[PDB]
Protein backbone atom coordinates (compact mmCIF):
# COMPACT_ATOMS: atom_id res chain seq x y z
CA UNK A 1 0.00 0.00 0.00
CA UNK A 2 1.42 3.12 -1.01
CA UNK A 3 0.77 6.01 0.95
CA UNK A 4 1.33 9.73 1.94
CA UNK A 5 0.14 10.99 5.33
CA UNK A 6 0.63 14.29 6.90
CA UNK A 7 0.04 15.43 10.00
CA UNK A 8 1.16 19.02 12.21
CA UNK A 9 -1.25 21.12 10.95
CA UNK A 10 -3.63 23.13 13.42
CA UNK A 11 -4.69 27.28 14.26
CA UNK A 12 -1.59 29.51 14.65
CA UNK A 13 -1.40 33.11 15.38
CA UNK A 14 -0.71 35.44 12.31
CA UNK A 15 3.50 35.77 12.46
CA UNK A 16 4.00 32.40 14.44
CA UNK A 17 5.39 28.89 13.46
CA UNK A 18 4.17 25.46 13.04
CA UNK A 19 6.12 22.25 11.60
CA UNK A 20 4.45 19.97 8.82
CA UNK A 21 5.16 16.28 8.67
CA UNK A 22 4.21 13.58 6.16
CA UNK A 23 5.09 9.89 6.66
CA UNK A 24 5.84 7.98 3.41
CA UNK A 25 4.84 4.15 3.45
CA UNK A 26 4.63 1.11 1.28
CA UNK A 27 7.94 2.32 -0.69
CA UNK A 28 11.56 3.08 -0.50
CA UNK A 29 11.27 6.85 0.46
CA UNK A 30 15.09 7.41 -0.39
CA UNK A 31 14.82 6.88 -4.06
CA UNK A 32 12.15 10.22 -4.56
CA UNK A 33 12.54 14.08 -4.85
CA UNK A 34 9.13 14.95 -2.55
CA UNK A 35 7.15 18.11 -2.61
CA UNK A 36 4.71 20.32 -0.53
CA UNK A 37 1.35 21.89 -2.45
CA UNK A 38 -1.16 23.83 -0.94
CA UNK A 39 -4.47 24.95 -1.62
CA UNK A 40 -7.11 27.24 0.04
CA UNK A 41 -10.61 26.87 -0.17
CA UNK A 42 -12.33 28.20 -3.86
CA UNK A 43 -8.30 28.63 -4.87
CA UNK A 44 -5.95 26.65 -7.09
CA UNK A 45 -3.03 24.47 -5.99
CA UNK A 46 0.11 26.46 -5.09
CA UNK A 47 3.13 24.58 -5.25
CA UNK A 48 5.40 25.35 -1.93
CA UNK A 49 8.65 23.73 -2.05
CA UNK A 50 10.38 20.17 -3.45
CA UNK A 51 13.82 18.11 -1.99
CA UNK A 52 15.50 15.74 -3.80
CA UNK A 53 16.25 12.32 -2.77
CA UNK A 54 19.33 12.69 -0.78
CA UNK A 55 18.23 16.93 0.16
CA UNK A 56 21.40 17.97 -2.20
CA UNK A 57 18.85 19.97 -4.40
CA UNK A 58 15.90 22.13 -2.79
CA UNK A 59 13.51 24.88 -4.02
CA UNK A 60 11.45 27.01 -3.26
CA UNK A 61 7.91 28.93 -4.48
CA UNK A 62 8.97 33.12 -4.22
CA UNK A 63 6.03 32.98 -1.80
CA UNK A 64 7.53 31.42 1.12
CA UNK A 65 11.38 31.46 0.39
CA UNK A 66 13.16 32.72 3.46
CA UNK A 67 10.35 31.85 6.07
CA UNK A 68 9.55 27.48 5.10
CA UNK A 69 12.05 25.51 5.48
CA UNK A 70 11.47 22.07 4.21
CA UNK A 71 13.80 18.88 5.50
CA UNK A 72 13.53 14.75 5.38
CA UNK A 73 14.72 12.15 7.36
CA UNK A 74 14.92 8.88 4.98
CA UNK A 75 16.18 6.77 7.94
CA UNK A 76 11.98 7.78 9.42
CA UNK A 77 10.80 7.99 5.84
CA UNK A 78 9.71 11.29 6.94
CA UNK A 79 9.20 15.03 4.80
CA UNK A 80 8.95 17.89 6.81
CA UNK A 81 8.03 21.56 6.70
CA UNK A 82 9.33 24.12 9.40
CA UNK A 83 7.00 27.09 8.69
CA UNK A 84 7.58 30.51 10.20
CA UNK A 85 6.30 34.23 10.03
CA UNK A 86 2.77 32.84 9.42
CA UNK A 87 0.31 35.08 7.47
CA UNK A 88 -3.20 34.55 6.91
CA UNK A 89 -2.35 34.09 3.24
CA UNK A 90 -0.37 30.70 4.02
CA UNK A 91 -3.58 29.34 5.62
CA UNK A 92 -4.93 26.16 3.39
CA UNK A 93 -4.92 22.50 3.60
CA UNK A 94 -1.21 21.53 3.15
CA UNK A 95 -0.14 18.10 0.81
CA UNK A 96 2.73 16.53 0.46
CA UNK A 97 3.29 14.47 -3.09
CA UNK A 98 5.76 12.08 -4.41
CA UNK A 99 7.56 13.02 -7.96
CA UNK A 100 8.86 10.37 -10.56
CA UNK A 101 12.20 10.46 -11.81
CA UNK A 102 11.95 10.51 -15.34
CA UNK A 103 8.96 12.35 -15.94
CA UNK A 104 8.64 14.65 -12.62
CA UNK A 105 5.10 13.79 -12.19
CA UNK A 106 3.34 13.63 -8.82
CA UNK A 107 1.87 10.38 -8.87
CA UNK A 108 1.23 9.79 -5.39
CA UNK A 109 -0.53 12.70 -3.29
CA UNK A 110 -1.32 12.55 0.87
CA UNK A 111 -4.64 13.42 2.18
CA UNK A 112 -3.63 17.00 3.69
CA UNK A 113 -3.22 18.53 6.59
CA UNK A 114 -5.22 21.91 7.30
CA UNK A 115 -3.23 25.10 8.51
CA UNK A 116 -5.29 28.17 9.58
CA UNK A 117 -3.70 31.54 10.47
CA UNK A 118 -6.34 33.37 12.45
CA UNK A 119 -6.06 35.71 15.24
CA UNK A 120 -0.94 32.00 -11.39
CA UNK A 121 1.88 32.05 -14.43
CA UNK A 122 -0.24 29.19 -16.44
CA UNK A 123 -3.33 30.45 -17.83
CA UNK A 124 -6.12 28.00 -17.91
CA UNK A 125 -10.39 29.21 -18.16
CA UNK A 126 -11.75 29.42 -14.59
CA UNK A 127 -14.72 27.48 -15.88
CA UNK A 128 -15.95 24.76 -18.47
CA UNK A 129 -19.31 22.81 -19.32
CA UNK A 130 -21.04 20.04 -21.16
CA UNK A 131 -23.16 17.75 -21.16
CA UNK A 132 -22.83 13.82 -21.06
CA UNK A 133 -21.18 12.63 -23.73
CA UNK A 134 -19.78 15.29 -25.32
CA UNK A 135 -16.46 16.22 -25.71
CA UNK A 136 -14.53 19.10 -23.76
CA UNK A 137 -11.14 20.67 -24.44
CA UNK A 138 -9.92 22.96 -21.57
CA UNK A 139 -6.49 24.69 -22.74
CA UNK A 140 -3.29 25.67 -20.34
CA UNK A 141 -1.48 29.01 -21.76
CA UNK A 142 2.05 29.21 -20.68
CA UNK A 143 5.44 30.82 -21.92
CA UNK A 144 8.73 29.79 -23.20
CA UNK A 145 10.17 29.37 -19.91
CA UNK A 146 7.57 26.78 -18.83
CA UNK A 147 5.44 25.28 -21.37
CA UNK A 148 7.95 25.85 -23.94
CA UNK A 149 11.06 24.06 -22.18
CA UNK A 150 9.72 20.88 -20.10
CA UNK A 151 7.02 18.83 -20.32
CA UNK A 152 2.93 19.49 -18.73
CA UNK A 153 1.23 17.21 -16.21
CA UNK A 154 -2.87 17.87 -15.84
CA UNK A 155 -4.50 16.97 -12.37
CA UNK A 156 -7.97 16.11 -11.48
CA UNK A 157 -9.56 16.98 -8.33
CA UNK A 158 -12.72 15.40 -7.33
CA UNK A 159 -14.58 18.30 -4.99
CA UNK A 160 -13.25 18.03 -1.31
CA UNK A 161 -10.71 15.61 -1.69
CA UNK A 162 -6.45 14.99 -2.66
CA UNK A 163 -5.44 15.87 -6.78
CA UNK A 164 -4.75 12.72 -8.64
CA UNK A 165 -2.69 12.34 -11.40
CA UNK A 166 -4.35 12.37 -14.51
CA UNK A 167 -1.98 13.08 -17.60
CA UNK A 168 1.92 13.19 -17.28
CA UNK A 169 4.73 13.65 -20.04
CA UNK A 170 2.20 15.99 -21.86
CA UNK A 171 -0.22 13.02 -23.05
CA UNK A 172 0.33 9.92 -20.74
CA UNK A 173 -2.37 8.25 -18.60
CA UNK A 174 -1.14 6.74 -15.66
CA UNK A 175 -3.04 2.77 -14.85
CA UNK A 176 -6.62 3.63 -13.80
CA UNK A 177 -7.20 6.91 -15.92
CA UNK A 178 -9.66 6.33 -18.96
CA UNK A 179 -8.78 6.80 -22.34
CA UNK A 180 -11.60 9.43 -22.34
CA UNK A 181 -8.86 11.68 -21.31
CA UNK A 182 -6.04 12.85 -23.65
CA UNK A 183 -3.39 15.98 -23.37
CA UNK A 184 -1.44 17.74 -25.77
CA UNK A 185 0.81 20.42 -26.17
CA UNK A 186 1.72 22.85 -29.03
CA UNK A 187 4.20 25.71 -28.57
CA UNK A 188 4.06 27.11 -24.95
CA UNK A 189 0.21 25.84 -25.09
CA UNK A 190 -1.13 22.71 -23.71
CA UNK A 191 -4.74 21.03 -23.74
CA UNK A 192 -6.96 18.43 -21.94
CA UNK A 193 -9.62 17.06 -23.85
CA UNK A 194 -12.33 14.67 -22.49
CA UNK A 195 -13.85 12.64 -24.43
CA UNK A 196 -17.90 11.24 -23.74
CA UNK A 197 -18.48 13.56 -20.94
CA UNK A 198 -19.43 11.66 -17.62
CA UNK A 199 -21.34 12.87 -14.22
CA UNK A 200 -18.27 12.04 -12.00
CA UNK A 201 -15.89 13.71 -14.01
CA UNK A 202 -17.34 17.01 -12.44
CA UNK A 203 -13.88 18.62 -11.20
CA UNK A 204 -11.24 20.90 -10.66
CA UNK A 205 -8.28 20.24 -13.76
CA UNK A 206 -4.66 21.94 -13.33
CA UNK A 207 -2.27 22.25 -15.68
CA UNK A 208 1.52 22.47 -14.38
CA UNK A 209 5.01 22.88 -15.74
CA UNK A 210 8.50 22.51 -14.49
CA UNK A 211 9.67 26.97 -15.09
CA UNK A 212 13.44 27.09 -16.33
CA UNK A 213 13.34 31.23 -14.98
CA UNK A 214 11.86 30.71 -11.83
CA UNK A 215 13.41 27.48 -10.90
CA UNK A 216 10.27 26.57 -9.74
CA UNK A 217 6.92 24.80 -10.36
CA UNK A 218 4.19 26.35 -11.76
CA UNK A 219 0.49 25.69 -11.53
CA UNK A 220 -2.29 26.80 -13.68
CA UNK A 221 -5.03 28.64 -11.46
CA UNK A 222 -7.57 25.44 -12.08
CA UNK A 223 -10.82 25.24 -14.42
CA UNK A 224 -13.56 23.94 -12.38
CA UNK A 225 -15.71 21.38 -15.40
CA UNK A 226 -19.60 21.02 -14.47
CA UNK A 227 -21.37 18.13 -15.58
CA UNK A 228 -25.09 19.62 -17.01
CA UNK A 229 -27.97 17.78 -17.29
CA UNK A 230 -28.47 15.46 -20.44
CA UNK A 231 -30.75 17.37 -22.29
CA UNK A 232 -34.41 16.34 -23.95
CA UNK A 233 -34.25 13.13 -25.69
CA UNK A 234 -37.90 13.82 -26.25
CA UNK A 235 -39.67 16.78 -27.30
CA UNK A 236 -43.58 17.01 -27.84
CA UNK A 237 -45.94 19.92 -29.76
CA UNK A 238 -49.12 20.07 -30.06
Known amino acids: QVTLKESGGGLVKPGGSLRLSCAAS????????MNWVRQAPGKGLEWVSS????????YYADSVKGRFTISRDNAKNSLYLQMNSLRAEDTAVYYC????????????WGQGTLVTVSSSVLTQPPSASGTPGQRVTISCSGS????????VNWYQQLPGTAPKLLIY???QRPSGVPDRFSGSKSGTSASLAISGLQSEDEADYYC???????????FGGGTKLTVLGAAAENLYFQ
Open 208 to 218: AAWDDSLNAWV
Open 144 to 151: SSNIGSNT
Open 51 to 58: ISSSSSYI
Open 26 to 33: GFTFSSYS
Open 97 to 108: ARQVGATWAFDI
Open 169 to 171: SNN
